[PDB]
Amino acid sequence: GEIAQAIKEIAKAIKEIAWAIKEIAQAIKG
Amino acid sequence: GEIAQAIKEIAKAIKEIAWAIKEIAQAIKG
Amino acid sequence: GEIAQAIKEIAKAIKEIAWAIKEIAQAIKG
Amino acid sequence: GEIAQAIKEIAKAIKEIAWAIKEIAQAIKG
Amino acid sequence: GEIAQAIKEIAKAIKEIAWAIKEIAQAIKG
Amino acid sequence: GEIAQAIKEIAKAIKEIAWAIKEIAQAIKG
Amino acid sequence: GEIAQAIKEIAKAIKEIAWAIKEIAQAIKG
Amino acid sequence: GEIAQAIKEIAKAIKEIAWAIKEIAQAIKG
Secondary structure, eight states: OHHHHHHHHHHHHHHHHHHHHHHHHHHHHO | OHHHHHHHHHHHHHHHHHHHHHHHHHHHHO | OHHHHHHHHHHHHHHHHHHHHHHHHHHHHO | OHHHHHHHHHHHHHHHHHHHHHHHHHHHHO | OHHHHHHHHHHHHHHHHHHHHHHHHHHHHO | OHHHHHHHHHHHHHHHHHHHHHHHHHHHHO | OHHHHHHHHHHHHHHHHHHHHHHHHHHHHO | OHHHHHHHHHHHHHHHHHHHHHHHHHHHHO
């Protein structure tokens, strides 16, 4: 359904934020 | 539907936050 | 509809957060 | 409606977070 | 209604986050 | 209702994030 | 109900974020 | 149901953000 799919698009975007935060950890450590 | 589309607009905005955090990571690496 | 519009208002606010985070990247880089 | 209005209250609060992040950006620039 | 009130409780919590972020700006500036 | 109560649980968790950010502010001030 | 339980899973995840932010306060203070 | 499952996908993504923040904490401690 379109609303479940839209909700899933939110979850994928949140995963992008987690990845970006991971990059900041790499930046600090380096 | 309008609700599903508005939920997608939230997902797009959340992606924009991910891109901005990536910019912070790169600014730290530099 | 009023609920779709309210949801869209959330997406616009999230976009404001992304912009502010972009500013922090500029601040760090400078 | 009360639900749409409560959702708008969330959007206003999310804007307040954007303003606060802008203050961090300016504090770094200073 | 109970669901609108619960949603409003979310908005108030988000406002608490904005205030805390404001404190971080004060901390940095000081 | 169970849905309203679960939404309140999210609001309580969001408050916990505010408290944690306040701890960062105080750690910076110190 | 499954939707209330899913919402509760969101609240527990948000609590994990609060805990992680608490760790950052400890890291800064130390 | 598909909606409950999509909401769970959001919770999993939010956990991923917690793990990433923990990495920042450890990078600071190091």
